[PDB]
Amino acid sequence: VGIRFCQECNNMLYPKEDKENRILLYACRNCDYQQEADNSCIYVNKITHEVDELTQIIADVSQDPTLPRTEDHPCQKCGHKEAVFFQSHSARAEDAMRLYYVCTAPHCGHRWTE
Amino acid sequence: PTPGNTLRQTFENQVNRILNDARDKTGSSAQKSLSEYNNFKSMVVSGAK
Amino acid sequence: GPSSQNVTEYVVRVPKNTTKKYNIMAFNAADKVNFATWNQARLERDLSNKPEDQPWLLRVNGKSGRKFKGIKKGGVTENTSYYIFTQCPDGAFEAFPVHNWYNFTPLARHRTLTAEEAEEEWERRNKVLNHFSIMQQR
Ligand SMILES: [Zn+2]
Ligand SMILES: [Zn+2]
């Protein structure tokens, strides 16, 4: 779910199992630096690929000129009855025609998808 | 979605079906509006061109 | 208090020339460098070319500590000028232009694979077995 790097030579960390204490042991095999990982996860792959695109969308896309501009469907944190709607248009990441609403206020940026 | 079809594919198929039905209906109305003396009708009922 | 409306007014001074040339470091924060380790330092020349237009070298604590190699920035300071403001008891800021900016990166201290024996594990282009124990043979 996440990776980190070595400390004193600053290299990439590889897994290792421990023969005695039976705990997974991430280690740099360019070194002898051994430590445990609290995540206890090494590999995950969402093959159907239902990632959350709410973190994917830049908060500054709303201030685009050539994007659409609706008047209904107001924002949540602020009222601001004006918003922009568009689609993801990302290849290989699903086929949904469902719309991605972003608030267009200069200091807002709470985006929602209904 | 239509079974066996992509959601974009079935959306495009529905839009194409609606616009083709519209063009068929408007062509039928235009053909019914033609007079007997209309030469455009005569050229295509004769089959010359 | 006084810090809620604190106003500080200091004097900027530029001397014309200094007998000792000044420059600037470049360390990444992701390197996680400490200054308590800085007990003995070396800064010498590279010998790979064999001097002013040649990349740099630095040593920490001899061979025990980590190693850096310095390279000069590619851009020219024809339209840029960088100043260093130093605090002094007289209270007047000093403005000193830097000469060059050098970039430094850490180096590993281990049995790196030499090039004359690097060709034997290229026949195992895809046939390579046990990536995790290549260092064990060395
Ligand atoms: Zn390491
Ligand atoms: Zn808002």
Q: How far is CA A65 from the centre of its chain?
A: 26
- Judgement on whether residues A27 and A60 belong to the same structural domain of the protein: no
CB contact under 8 A, A97 and B6: no
Q: Are A26 and A5 in contact, with CB atoms under 8 Å apart?
A: no
Pairing state between β C11-13 and C92-97: parallel
CB-based contact (8 Å) between B26 and chain A? no
Mutation choice for A interface testing from C27, C69, C110, C137 by most A CBs within 10 A: C110
Domain of A65 in residue numbering reads as 46-114
CB contact under 8 A, C132 and A9: no
Which residues of chain A make contact with B6, given a CB cutoff of 8 A? Answer: 95
Closest-CA residue to A101 (of A92, A71, A90, C135): A71
- Judgement on whether residues A111 and A62 belong to the same structural domain of the protein: yes
For C53, residues 6+ apart whose C-beta sits below 8 A from its C-beta are C72
Counted domains in chain C? 1
Which residues of chain C make contact with A31, given a CB cutoff of 8 A? Answer: 110
Please report, for residues C28, C38, C39, C40, C87, the alpha-carbon distance to residue C35 in angstroms, rounded to integers and kept in the order given.
Answer: 14, 5, 8, 11, 20
**Beta bridge partners of residue C101, listed in sequence order:** C24
Backbone angles phi, psi at B46, to 5 degrees: -70, -35
Q: Are A23 and A70 in contact, with CB atoms under 8 Å apart?
A: no
Q: Are A111 and A57 in contact, with CB atoms under 8 Å apart?
A: yes
Find the A61 Cα to ligand 2 centroid distance in Å. Answer: 13
CB contact under 8 A, C106 and A9: yes
Which residue has tokens 């051994």? A34
- Judgement on whether residues A26 and A37 belong to the same structural domain of the protein: yes
Find the A99 Cα to ligand 2 centroid distance in Å. Answer: 17
- Judgement on whether residues A62 and A113 belong to the same structural domain of the protein: yes
- Judgement on whether residues A32 and A19 belong to the same structural domain of the protein: yes
Find the A78 Cα to ligand 2 centroid distance in Å. Answer: 4
Closest-CA residue to C97 (of C79, C82, C85, C86): C82
Please report, for residues A82, B12, B41, the alpha-carbon distance to residue B22 in angstroms, rounded to integers and kept in the order given.
Answer: 35, 15, 21
d(CA C130, CA C124): 11
Cβ-nearest to C108 among A14, A16, A30 = A30
CB contact under 8 A, A96 and B11: no
d(CA C95, CA C24): 14
Backbone angles phi, psi at C54, to 5 degrees: -125, 140
d(CA C74, CA C87): 31
- Judgement on whether residues A31 and A59 belong to the same structural domain of the protein: no
Q: Are C79 and C4 in contact, with CB atoms under 8 Å apart?
A: no
Q: List residues of chain C with CB under 8 Å from any CB of chain A.
A: 31-32, 66, 106, 108-110, 132, 135
- The conformation of residue C101, written as its DSSP 8-state character, comes to B
Find the A18 Cα to ligand 1 centroid distance in Å. Answer: 18
Distance from CA of C15 to the nearest CA of A (A): 42
- Judgement on whether residues A60 and A91 belong to the same structural domain of the protein: yes
Domain of C106 in residue numbering reads as 1-138
Would the CA dihedral through C38, C44, C45, C48 be positive or negative? negative
Structure tokens at B3: 């079974």
- Judgement on whether residues A22 and A59 belong to the same structural domain of the protein: no
d(CA C8, CA C91): 10
Q: Are C106 and C31 in contact, with CB atoms under 8 Å apart?
A: yes
Structure resolution in Å? Answer: 3.4
Counted domains in chain A? 2
Distance from CA of A29 to the nearest CA of C (A): 7
- Judgement on whether residues A52 and A41 belong to the same structural domain of the protein: no
d(CA A29, CA A102): 46
